[PDB]
Amino acid sequence: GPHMATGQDRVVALVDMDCFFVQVEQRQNPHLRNKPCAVVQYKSWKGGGIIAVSYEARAFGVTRSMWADDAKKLCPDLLLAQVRESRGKANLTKYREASVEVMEIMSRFAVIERAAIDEAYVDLTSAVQERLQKLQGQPISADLLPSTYIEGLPQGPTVQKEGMRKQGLFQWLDSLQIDNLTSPDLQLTVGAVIVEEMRAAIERETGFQCSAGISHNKVLAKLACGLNKPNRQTLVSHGSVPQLFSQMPIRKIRSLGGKLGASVIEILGIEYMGELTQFTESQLQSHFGEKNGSWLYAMCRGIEHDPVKPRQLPKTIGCSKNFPGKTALATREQVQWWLLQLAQELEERLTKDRNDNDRVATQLVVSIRVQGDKRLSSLRRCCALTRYDAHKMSHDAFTVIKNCNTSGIQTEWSPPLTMLFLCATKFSAS
DNA sequence: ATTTTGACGCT
DNA sequence: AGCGTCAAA
Ligand SMILES: [Ca+2]
Ligand SMILES: [Mg+2]
Ligand SMILES: [Mg+2]
């Protein structure tokens, strides 16, 4: 009752760019705008692997991970943009730079946590308090929320999408208590007003559209974001959680899409997030561990305390290349040449990072995969990163992995290498 | 023969 | 430290 926390103490948004790499390429090449199109890496093997897909192309069934040759079977007029190749490998610089554009705009509004190349969490609690003080009891107009959905509405006693959106928004705003500055629902609504402004700023200043979720915590904000993509935002209130979770597959909640979620389903014999409420906290801890159990117990009630971390920059800078099938590296010269290629890209990126962000990486992580291992990485070794020099870094990586070559012949490498990975970590101020 | 990333937990 | 899990485009 009066002491039960309800996880309504914060306003958190999650902003996620729509079909991000596709929008970067469509900005650059107007011929691709408003077309079925996809972004592809490499071309010789089956036309290249698709990594991003416009919504027009998704209508034909094109998805990520599809070979372009296969996507063309579903969508013969599919347009393609290729990821840049430098030093023999795909190079994602253009997308990293576009990400910085968006992250810098979002940081004007609030502290952000960079969650991926195209998404960030925003802690809006303080901005909301400020805006409520500015508003001075003034009601919030639907015109301030032109792209907002209120999850769960309309309800109770138009057949077009925008009509339904407005009906739900009208029901929500008609029922708000705008004179109570401590009302969580009002706080979320002001949060959504701010996110409309942030999304408008992103589109105005970059050309890129995005979706967003607004709720009381990161997990619900992320879930909310996906409910009405693209180019829309969704408010998930605390009160919407029971109905929302009553038919929500467990795997849809962030962190439950893999083995742990599968085990929750198998061990407990349930399917939907809401079914978790019938277990005690101790029961959940007994199956999934102390941390996961407490997290599940609160999360299924819509409560999560994970903070929006103040971190706009990536914590690592890495470069990786697979060598599948017959292309596996089987000679020492090959291994050294590709380590050099990777180290040269890494050096370029590190030097730019040092100039932009006043920091230096101090550890180099080398990871490899040998033919015949189901795991992504077969071996990982670290060494000191003391100089931003590609030849030194490639030599040091070779030194730390050379003992993996079983082959009695110095010139031959066995078992062949199917992946090389260099990652700069452990940044210190500079 | 998706590939190329990036964060964080476990022991 | 090295390995594993989960998640982005
Ligand atoms: Ca996205
Ligand atoms: Mg994303
Ligand atoms: Mg995606």
A36, amino acid identity: P
**A351 CA → ligand 2 middle, Å:** 27
Cβ within 7 Å of strand B: which of A 265-294?
289, 291-292
Give the nucleotide at minimum CA-to-C1' distance from A119.
C8
- Omega before A314 within 30 of 0, i.e. cis: no
The answer to whether A116 and A311 are in contact (CB under 8 A) is no
Bridging pattern class, strands A112-116 and A412-429: unpaired
Closest residue by Cα to the C1' atom of nucleotide B4? A320
Nucleotides on chain B within 7 angstroms of protein Cβ: 1-10
Q: How far in angstroms lies nucleotide B2's C1' from the CA of residue A67? A: 8
Q: How far in angstroms lies nucleotide B1's C1' from the CA of residue A418? A: 11
Q: How far apart are CA A142 and CA A201, in angstroms?
A: 19
Q: How far apart are CA A308 and CA A380, in angstroms?
A: 30
Q: Which residue reads 């079977």 in tokens?
A: A73
CA torsion sign for A221, A227, A233, A234 is negative
Q: Could you check: is the Cβ of residue A315 within 7 Å of any atom of nucleic acid strand C?
A: no
**A298 CA → ligand 2 middle, Å:** 25
Please give the annotated binding residues of A for Mg(2+), written as ranges: 16-17, 118-119
Q: Could you check: is the Cβ of residue A258 within 7 Å of any atom of nucleic acid strand C?
A: yes
**A254 CA → ligand 2 middle, Å:** 12
Cβ within 7 Å of strand C: which of A 215-254?
253-254
Structure tokens at A381: 């070794």
A215, amino acid identity: S
Q: How far apart are CA A108 and CA A200, in angstroms?
A: 13
**A229 CA → ligand 1 middle, Å:** 9
The ligand placed nearest to the CA atom of residue A121 is 2
Resolution (A): 1.7
Residues 6 or more apart from A395 whose CB is under 8 A from it?
none
Q: Could you check: is the Cβ of residue A210 within 7 Å of any atom of nucleic acid strand B?
A: no
Q: Could you check: is the Cβ of residue A374 within 7 Å of any atom of nucleic acid strand B?
A: no
Q: Could you check: is the Cβ of residue A92 within 7 Å of any atom of nucleic acid strand B?
A: yes
- Omega before A415 within 30 of 0, i.e. cis: yes
Q: How far in angstroms lies nucleotide C8's C1' from the CA of residue A61? A: 20
Q: Could you check: is the Cβ of residue A383 within 7 Å of any atom of nucleic acid strand C?
A: no
Q: How far in angstroms lies nucleotide B10's C1' from the CA of residue A399? A: 28
Q: How far in angstroms lies nucleotide B2's C1' from the CA of residue A324? A: 11
Report which of A268, A291, A263 is spatially closest to residue A279, judged by C-alpha positions: A268
Burial A35-47 (b: 16+ CB within 10 A, else e): ebbbbbbeeeeeb
The ligand placed nearest to the CA atom of residue A64 is 3
Q: Could you check: is the Cβ of residue A20 within 7 Å of any atom of nucleic acid strand C?
A: yes
Cβ within 7 Å of strand B: which of A 296-335?
309, 311, 314-322, 324-327
Q: How far in angstroms lies nucleotide B11's C1' from the CA of residue A91? A: 35
Q: How far apart are CA A161 and CA A43, in angstroms?
A: 39
**A292 CA → ligand 3 middle, Å:** 25
Give the nucleotide at minimum CA-to-C1' distance from A64.
B2
Q: How far apart are CA A117 and CA A302, in angstroms?
A: 26
User: Checking phi first, is residue A255 left (phi over 0); if not, alpha (psi -120 to 50) or beta?
Assistant: left
